[PDB]
Design an enzyme around this catalytic site. Structure first.
Site, mmCIF file in Angstrom:
data_model
loop_
_atom_site.group_PDB
_atom_site.id
_atom_site.type_symbol
_atom_site.label_atom_id
_atom_site.label_comp_id
_atom_site.label_asym_id
_atom_site.label_seq_id
_atom_site.Cartn_x
_atom_site.Cartn_y
_atom_site.Cartn_z
ATOM 1 N N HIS A 153 -1.409 -4.065 -7.107
ATOM 2 C CA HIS A 153 -2.068 -3.695 -5.865
ATOM 3 C C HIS A 153 -3.556 -4.063 -5.871
ATOM 4 C CE1 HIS A 153 -3.712 -0.604 -2.942
ATOM 5 N NE2 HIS A 153 -2.852 -1.302 -2.219
ATOM 6 N N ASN A 187 -6.849 5.276 -3.810
ATOM 7 C CA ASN A 187 -6.615 5.949 -2.536
ATOM 8 C C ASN A 187 -6.329 7.437 -2.781
ATOM 9 O OD1 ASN A 187 -6.869 3.300 -1.575
ATOM 10 N ND2 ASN A 187 -4.657 3.012 -1.270
ATOM 11 N N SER A 243 0.830 -1.194 0.000
ATOM 12 C CA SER A 243 0.000 0.000 0.000
ATOM 13 C C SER A 243 0.869 1.251 0.000
ATOM 14 C CB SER A 243 -0.915 0.025 1.227
ATOM 15 O OG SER A 243 -1.828 -1.059 1.211
ATOM 16 N N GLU A 256 -4.438 -2.524 -9.411
ATOM 17 C CA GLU A 256 -3.641 -1.385 -9.870
ATOM 18 C C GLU A 256 -2.217 -1.804 -10.212
ATOM 19 O OE1 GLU A 256 -4.771 0.984 -6.371
ATOM 20 O OE2 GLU A 256 -5.675 2.425 -7.761
#
Ligand SMILES: NC(=O)c1ccc[n+]([C@@H]2O[C@H](COP(=O)([O-])OP(=O)(O)OC[C@H]3O[C@@H](n4cnc5c(N)ncnc54)[C@H](O)[C@@H]3O)[C@@H](O)[C@H]2O)c1
Ligand SMILES: NC(=O)c1ccc[n+]([C@@H]2O[C@H](COP(=O)([O-])OP(=O)(O)OC[C@H]3O[C@@H](n4cnc5c(N)ncnc54)[C@H](O)[C@@H]3O)[C@@H](O)[C@H]2O)c1
Lengths: 283, 283
Positions: A143, A194, A122, A155
């Protein structure tokens, strides 16, 4: 002739087990790697949990299909053996610069030349890791999102050093295991999702802390104004207030003001969000 | 005995006409005020446009109901006469500190003591205006969204000086004309909706400008990740790229980088968004 067939996942935790299982469910030959036999026993328990989830929730998993995927997974606590014939290694070890550093140096040495490396990290940027790997043209980020079977984005984010033909083959692997590839072009902290979401949640937090409006108001304003199904605070509850607190507490002054707000009004009262049955909302 | 009955709207532009018409449609006695007979003629044209829209789009507007609302509206270009028996005045004059300053000083003098004042201003804060009014306990913001008949929120935002019994009666007026009252507690630039939305759109803009990912990717990531019906760039197209450019060009360095990006790649090519048939997407 052929491409990715053998996939080894490093770590069998929350995301490691989901990644491994989704990959096994889609017909790849999967080895789950973890530190010792006790970690492997716990991995098996998660895999059996996931198998149950799949048979109720995932297309094509019924009538023994999820069990068959479960039964086909190999467990290993010897990294050398775990990656010996690996086409792809997906790394989901704890979020720890030191612990990932350790991992990649060894992995760079033990994995055959062909092996592509992919981190699920992350916060740790690939560039922060590319060094320890020793194969930068074969190192990138893949990801996932928690509950990969339904939040099925992956991702793909490489380094300047990453080999484009490798990046593309990871993208295609992502499709092969039923993910929606989200292709980033340049490295970016927080990838895409995010990066979009944190600012929205921060803006909502500010409104709440500064006493501008209550959660319900802020949420209905967002749903009505954008047509979104859930407002910021419903999203906080889904993310989990413990996670939101961790992140809020290591950012600018205003967020820290929010973290303290969560701690006093929710964390300290045991209202941690959706998973525990109550956060900003009661469920 | 009774409360708000006579409402005068100052300005018959894009939002003034929608506000006036929705209010007339819900049975209030409406006077539309504008500067001269030519502005009033143009107001009438808008009202006839809205009437047509209502009969096709709005519950209860069919079979002459929208025409009856249209026919009942009064026009005035004499402010004194326009607000002489006004219970509520809704101000939607151009977004200009000088022009609103002028308005309120006169309005404070001409409107009977009972009259509540409400500004529809986007950027000008009530506090920035409360002075010129001369009745701060009866001055607040009642902020609408373009296409009030379907985007039916009304953000209620007063000053520290605002009278709570007035605020509540505005809230109830908002319900009476079919709006969802969004009640702010303290003043805030951009109220709630814009406060939430701008950060999301900015984060998306940054991703695009810095070459991290293309519009489609960013949009699908948002829809999939949050379940929202539309991604940031679909939203840009709805907002209109001209508006987005104006706002982007008067903010931090990164946004200005976006504004230049819009100008070069969309504005200069006549791709202004949804209303003109093409922006980030072709419609
Ligand atoms: N949890 C999420 O929501 C989420 C989302 C996206 C990405 N990630 C990333 O995945 C990684 C964290 O995984 P998680 O939190 O989903 O599971 P976890 O952290 O609960 O499990 C970690 C796994 O690594 C194992 N492990 C511990 N030490 C190890 C070591 N020394 N060498 C190899 N394995 C070791 C643990 O036993 C476990 O199997 C981080 O990169 C995190 O950023 C997590
Ligand atoms: N347009 C939007 O999307 C939107 C959304 C929310 C709030 N608002 C706010 O509404 C106001 C702007 O209205 P608009 O853009 O919807 O319509 P507009 O700006 O197109 O029309 C302005 C109206 O005011 C009239 N007018 C011009 N000079 C005047 C004056 N000297 N005294 C009285 N009236 C005068 C114009 O003739 C017209 O009737 C601003 O406060 C703006 O922030 C607009």
């Amino acid at each position: 002739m052929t491409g990715i067939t053998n996939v080894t996942v490093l770590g069998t935790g929350v995301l490691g087990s989901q990644i491994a299982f989704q990959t096994a469910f889609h017909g790849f030959a999967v080895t789950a790697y973890d530190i010792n036999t006790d970690a492997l026993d716990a991995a098996k328990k998660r895999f059996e949990g996931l198998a149950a989830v799949y048979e109720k929730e995932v297309a094509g998993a019924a009538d023994g299909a999820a069990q068959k995927a479960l039964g086909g997974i190999r467990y290993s606590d010897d990294l050398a053996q775990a990656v010996k014939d690996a086409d792809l290694v997906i790394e989901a070890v704890p979020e720890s610069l030191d612990l990932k550093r350790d991992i990649y140096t060894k992995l760079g040495e033990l994995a055959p030349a062909k092996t592509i490396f992919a981190t699920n990290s992350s916060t740790l940027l690939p560039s922060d890791l590319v060094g320890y790997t020793g194969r930068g043209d074969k190192f990138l980020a893949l990801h996932f999102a928690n509950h990969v079977w339904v939040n099925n984005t992956a991702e793909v984010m490489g380094t300047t050093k990453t080999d484009p033909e490798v990046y593309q083959q990871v993208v295609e692997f992502a499709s092969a295991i039923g993910m929606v590839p989200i292709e980033l072009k340049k490295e970016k902290a927080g990838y895409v999702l995010n990066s979009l979401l944190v600012p929205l949640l921060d803006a909502a937090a500010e409104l709440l802390v500064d006493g501008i409006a209550d959660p319900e108001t802020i949420d209905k304003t967002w749903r009505i104004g954008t047509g979104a199904p859930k407002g910021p605070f419903e999203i906080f509850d889904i993310v989990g207030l413990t996670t939101a607190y961790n992140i809020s507490s290591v950012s600018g002054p205003k967020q820290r003001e929010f973290a303290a707000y969560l701690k006093e009004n929710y964390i300290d009262k045991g209202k941690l969000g959706l998973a525990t049955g109550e956060g900003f909302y009661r469920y």
